[PDB]
Amino acid sequence: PQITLWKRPLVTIKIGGQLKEALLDTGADDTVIEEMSLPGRWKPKMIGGIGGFIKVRQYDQIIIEIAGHKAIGTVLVGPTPVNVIGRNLLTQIGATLNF
Amino acid sequence: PQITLWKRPLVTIKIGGQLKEALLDTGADDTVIEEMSLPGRWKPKMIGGIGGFIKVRQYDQIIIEIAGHKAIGTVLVGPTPVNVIGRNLLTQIGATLNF
Numbered sequence: 263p264q265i266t267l268w269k270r271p272l273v274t275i276k277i278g279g280q281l282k283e284a285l286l287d288t289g290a291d292d293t294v295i296e297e298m299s300l301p302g303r304w305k306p307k308m309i310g311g312i313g314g315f316i317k318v319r320q321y322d323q324i325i326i327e328i329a330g331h332k333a334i335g336t337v338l339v340g341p342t343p344v345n346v347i348g349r350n351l352l353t354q355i356g357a358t359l360n361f
Numbered sequence: 362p363q364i365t366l367w368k369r370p371l372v373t374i375k376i377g378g379q380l381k382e383a384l385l386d387t388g389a390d391d392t393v394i395e396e397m398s399l400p401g402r403w404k405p406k407m408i409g410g411i412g413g414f415i416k417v418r419q420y421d422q423i424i425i426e427i428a429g430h431k432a433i434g435t436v437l438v439g440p441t442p443v444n445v446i447g448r449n450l451l452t453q454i455g456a457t458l459n460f
């Protein structure tokens with residue numbers, strides 16, 4: 263698809279069997295998902311943005327279906343107010359910015 | 362151009378004759394730039410990011426060149442870890458996300 267930016271670029275994702283809405287975010291290095299459980303070992307990480315830093319749990323080798331495309335990579339889970347799909351997974355679905 | 366997302370989508374912008382670097386950020390509703398004086402009057406705005414809310418100075422109808430493309434619109438000035446070009450100006454330069 264070609265997604266216009268008049269509105270937030272929101273897509274349906276599927277992660278750990280759960281359907282969620284997430285923002286396609288070229289400004290985010292890594293994918294960050296609102297608090298949930300994910301299988302596997304995790305390690306703590308700090309990520310910073312507007313308003314400062316939050317501590318998240320970093321899970322590797324996580325599969326997410328993004329708008330019907332399967333991608334695999336690191337998924338951070340923490341007290342983010344929005345689900346964001348970051349560049350680490352955007353690349354895997356072949357997403358680009360065009361102007 | 363077409364911008365892939367393997368690296369941060371950082372571009373040069375020009376605002377009041379000064380060159381700055383900024384992040385093309387589809388996850389950002391608004392455009393926020395680090396402290397600088399802009400002409401004219403400003404008004405208060407609160408914006409929320411990953412770590413909570415910050416207060417910014419909102420200036421309207423500001424002329425800005427983004428990666429060679431002219432935009433005229435709202436620029437928020439305040440403590441951000443990186444200059445971000447948000448959807449309000451991404452739409453003016455004709456940017457779309459594609460996959």
Ligand SMILES: CC(C)CN(C[C@@H](O)[C@H](Cc1ccccc1)NC(=O)O[C@H]1CCOC1)S(=O)(=O)c1ccc(N)cc1
Nearest residue numbers: 289290291292309310311312344388389390391410411
């Ligand atoms: C601020 C940029 C540089 C960094 N973030 C991405 C941005 O797209 C961020 C995403 C977001 C949207 C809504 C609520 C909360 C977060 N938008 C954002 O702050 O919108 C503000 C700025 C102007 O308009 C409103 S991030 O969320 O901090 C982040 C950092 C690291 C990782 N790994 C993932 C995400």
